[PDB]
Amino acid sequence: MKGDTKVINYLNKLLGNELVAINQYFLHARMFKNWGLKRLNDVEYHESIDEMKHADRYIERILFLEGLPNLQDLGKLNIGEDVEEMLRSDLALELDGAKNLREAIGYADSVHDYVSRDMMIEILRDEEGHIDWLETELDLIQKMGLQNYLQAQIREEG
Amino acid sequence: MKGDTKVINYLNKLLGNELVAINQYFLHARMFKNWGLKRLNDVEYHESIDEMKHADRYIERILFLEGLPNLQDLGKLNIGEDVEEMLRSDLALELDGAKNLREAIGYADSVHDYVSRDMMIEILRDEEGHIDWLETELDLIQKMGLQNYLQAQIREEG
Amino acid sequence: MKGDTKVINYLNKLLGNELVAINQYFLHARMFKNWGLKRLNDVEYHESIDEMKHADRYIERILFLEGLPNLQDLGKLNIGEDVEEMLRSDLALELDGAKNLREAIGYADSVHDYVSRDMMIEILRDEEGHIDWLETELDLIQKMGLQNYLQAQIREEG
Amino acid sequence: MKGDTKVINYLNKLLGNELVAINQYFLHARMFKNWGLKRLNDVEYHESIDEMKHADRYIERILFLEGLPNLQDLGKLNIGEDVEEMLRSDLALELDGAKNLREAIGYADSVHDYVSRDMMIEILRDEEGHIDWLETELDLIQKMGLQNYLQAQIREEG
Amino acid sequence: MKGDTKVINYLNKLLGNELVAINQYFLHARMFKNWGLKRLNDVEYHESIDEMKHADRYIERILFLEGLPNLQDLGKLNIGEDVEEMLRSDLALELDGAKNLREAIGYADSVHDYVSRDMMIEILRDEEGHIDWLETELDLIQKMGLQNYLQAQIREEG
Amino acid sequence: MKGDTKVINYLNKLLGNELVAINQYFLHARMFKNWGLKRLNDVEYHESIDEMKHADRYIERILFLEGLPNLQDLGKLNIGEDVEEMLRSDLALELDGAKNLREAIGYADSVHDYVSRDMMIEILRDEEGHIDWLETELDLIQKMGLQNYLQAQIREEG
Amino acid sequence: MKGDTKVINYLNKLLGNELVAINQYFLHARMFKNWGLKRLNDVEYHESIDEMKHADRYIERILFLEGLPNLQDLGKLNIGEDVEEMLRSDLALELDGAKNLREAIGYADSVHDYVSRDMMIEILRDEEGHIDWLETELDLIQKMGLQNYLQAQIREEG
Ligand code: HEM
Ligand code: HEM
Ligand code: HEM
Ligand SMILES: [Fe+2]
Ligand SMILES: [Fe+2]
Ligand SMILES: [Fe+2]
Ligand SMILES: [Fe+2]
Ligand SMILES: [Fe+2]
Ligand SMILES: [Fe+2]
Ligand SMILES: [Fe+2]
Ligand SMILES: [Zn+2]
Ligand SMILES: [Zn+2]
Ligand SMILES: [Zn+2]
Ligand SMILES: [Zn+2]
Ligand SMILES: [Zn+2]
Ligand SMILES: [Zn+2]
Ligand SMILES: [Zn+2]
Ligand SMILES: [Zn+2]
Ligand SMILES: [Zn+2]
Ligand SMILES: [Zn+2]
Ligand SMILES: [Zn+2]
Ligand SMILES: [Zn+2]
Ligand SMILES: [Zn+2]
Ligand SMILES: [Zn+2]
């Protein structure tokens, strides 16, 4: 079913955000794993799978709407070298992606693509969950201090 | 444990090959799925997961060896517009990647990184399985003709 | 709870679309069944049940909003005499119904009937699934040819 | 128990036939497997195991009768390069072996080796089953055409 | 995937070794079985199945590499007439085959056929297990004497 | 089967490394256990069992190759008096042993003892896992501080 | 709890006996295993594990009593080249160790270390079980002769 061209472009831009997050979350996860921070590996890996699910939804939607998913262009990763820096980088990325989502959702409505909109609202709800987790962890670092925060990451949560 | 620098560079190059294959296999899978070619979606999606597992092994190995995994640079995807063209593109990509693997495996041996070598031989064995599947499908297209080949893809295999 | 009058009129128009689709899908299903095209019977019958579920939702919603569901007026069926013609007819009907849905969803929003809107977005998501299935089948007919396509319909899919 | 010398010679000749069939069926099976013709691999591999069971019976019988099983001499394989050619080659081989079996069974009777005869009649019954399968497949190739025949081989039968 | 020609020749030579061992182990097994030496039948039959598995791996590998498996040429069997002689003959054969394996493994490495090499190292590991079993049995014959050794073979081991 | 003499000498040297590690890991484990550091006892004890498994493989391999395993000579233990010192000592020992392994693996290849090589590559893979664990723990001590690190050891991990 | 210094020295001497027995029993076990003497491997390996358990008890006791377990010094192994010689060597070693145990048990009593004594009496009871097994086997060799004795070792006991 031929979709609106600018909806497809938005879907590809949002797909691009997901592709960056997939990689950045996955590297961050395995860095934490390497450092023995088991709990942070489990969550960040899970965040990565979440983004893969989001990318898959975009790809299938773009294809249904008869567009060409773009998996060739990869935006900038900002990896970071310590726990706080990497968590903040994930947060900045989530925030920019949520901004793009809000723009796309408004636009899909105005051209009556209510199912692309509905999909995107579900994804944004997931993103705000990701934002909440990052914000909470970053605040915990400050509240209990880094040494205590790191000790709390060495065992996986049941 | 500080690894050999050129082994790490090879691991990053091989990781780069996997990142291209992950995306190309995943798009191809969902294109087939869109077209109703259920069987080709299932296999290509599975090939994609295989490459993700390979990428994960590289990332963890690079990190152990104290290098920086590179997930920022993404080589060229060659998507293709019809079944044969997309299968051939996956094959060309596999063949180039197997070539790089052979070079890396020889080099790891000469610097005594026998566990990076061992990991890479396991991965190459998987790649040759991927090559075999692609070659077989492409030959089946020619042998039974495209119409019959397409009809054989519409139901998933048990 | 007294609903908006024009929302009720939209709900009745959309109900009318569903009543046409229920009958056209059901006849098409049993035509396919008669012809031994088991797989097409199963899917079209299922599409028919889907439309019945949609009609039921409209009826219950209209009644809640204190309107009179209209099951008396039945729009034009376009049955068709061969597989392709009947599938295209179902597609044209789905496309017109999706158009009406988009109009109604926009209008419900402007009068703040957010639950009629929410119901209608769910239904449209189902309709786009129906559209996708029809488009895919029609493309498969062209790609594998009619004889092969027909052979692929004689056994039901597990 | 000292057997008749010419019965032992017949048993060794029949053993020789089985050794050829074991190898030819096994190669043919893996050629089909390589080509993605899963169904033909399964049946030909099974035919190969059948011949191994036949060879085992001959070996044990020759030994009981106090002869020397001959596994050293291997007659001519005729492999063939395409499906029809390889199936016909298996058929020609089965037909020659059935001929030898008929001769041996007649002879065993005339020297009162009724248990060698009984074993050989069971084996011939199996061989005629193998002949029937080959003849049927070859006729199916002609009836549905090679392209359709090949498409029908790509999935294993439950 | 077109393999190296000399690797294919090595694979065919190694296949040839396996074909000899399959037959020699299988005859030896049924000779032992005839003699009531149940335990030696079970192990030698098992060794025979092992060699069949090895031959199958070679055949599939040669075919993947686009060569022609050679099951036509059968090297010399050395059957032997008593337990010690037959066990020694199996040992001499294993030793020659291990020698050929070592040569082939070195060569596959030098042309970067690391998966043929990997397969062959697995097979050699199995062969050294076969060598160990033969050497052990032969030493047991000398240590406990032949009469005691034979008595120990008449019941199968749980 | 008579092995290469220098391979046997390497196997005995590597066995010697394992015998040192068995004892040093086992004492370290029970020191941690005494101190109430349950988690460190469990892992170090497990590392000790791993080394015992490695020693067993060497012993069995040396014996197969017809050499004399040397369990008489025991190299220097470096026990250490506090957690960090003992973990570093285990690390230094692992690193020297990995060095010896790399040398032996290269040599086994050059004399075509591919199964001793294969065994040793498996063992080295295990050793690099041991190295990774030690490095990670030592870095955790510095990152969270010793007091927090010690508190994290008092309960065993599920 | 600060133990008596001479008790700790006795515990270390007894530990030293156990470390010799662990190694000698383990090598003897794998020599028997190599020779196909399955039953002797199972028992000697088990005796080895028993000594490991004894060593562990000493180590934990020494540490509790605030001494330094000595795993660095390893007394003389006497391996032996044939079954009888190796069994006698294990026996001589057990006998010397039982002698040391008797001395230590008497001394622990005189300084009121009744729990070290109690532990040591349990260990001595185990040692006398080991002595009994060795004496019995050695007498069986003489009674049934070596050839019969060896034949009786080739299958493991249920
Ligand atoms: C590029 C770096 C990536 C890495 C390292 C990676 C890694 C992984 C791993 C380890 C898994 C678990 C395998 C399993 O399902 O059992 C997984 C699952 C999955 N991946 Fe990826 N992936 C990557 C990118 C992608 C991309 C680009 C997509 C496309 C949208 C994708 C889609 C999926 C999906 C749909 C699953 C299955 C989710 C589930 O059911 O658990 N991944 N990935
Ligand atoms: C030529 C003399 C041979 C004899 C007498 C023989 C005999 C047997 C027998 C009795 C079996 C057990 C049947 C079963 O699987 O239940 C067997 C299994 C098998 N044979 Fe043969 N065989 C011979 C040669 C070969 C050859 C040349 C190949 C080709 C590589 C081969 C491949 C196999 C395989 C793959 C199995 C199944 C293994 C398993 O899963 O148990 N055999 N053979
Ligand atoms: C010298 C100091 C040693 C100590 C204190 C020690 C201690 C232990 C203990 C407590 C166990 C657990 C018992 C069980 O299996 O339930 C064990 C297991 C074992 N040990 Fe030792 N051991 C030592 C040396 C050795 C040596 C030199 C070897 C020879 C290679 C060895 C081989 C084994 C094996 C094969 C196991 C069984 C592993 C399993 O399946 O859990 N050990 N050891
Ligand atoms: Fe989630
Ligand atoms: Fe796979
Ligand atoms: Fe449905
Ligand atoms: Fe059969
Ligand atoms: Fe085996
Ligand atoms: Fe481990
Ligand atoms: Fe015991
Ligand atoms: Zn996302
Ligand atoms: Zn997110
Ligand atoms: Zn890969
Ligand atoms: Zn691949
Ligand atoms: Zn509907
Ligand atoms: Zn519909
Ligand atoms: Zn037969
Ligand atoms: Zn047959
Ligand atoms: Zn073999
Ligand atoms: Zn073998
Ligand atoms: Zn080790
Ligand atoms: Zn280690
Ligand atoms: Zn003891
Ligand atoms: Zn003892």
From Swiss-Prot, chains A, B, C, D, E, F, G:
Changing E127Q: Decreased Fe(2+) oxidation activity. Is also affected in its ability to lay down an iron core. It comes from the Bacteria. Iron oxidation is inhibited by Zn(2+), which binds at the ferroxidase center with a higher affinity that Fe(2+). The occupation of the ferroxidase center by Zn(2+) also severely restricts the ability of BFR to form an iron core. Its EC number is 1.16.3.1. The gene is bfr. One of its GO terms (biological process) is intracellular iron ion homeostasis. This is Bacterioferritin. Changing D96E: In strain: ECOR 30. Changing N78G: In strain: ECOR 30.
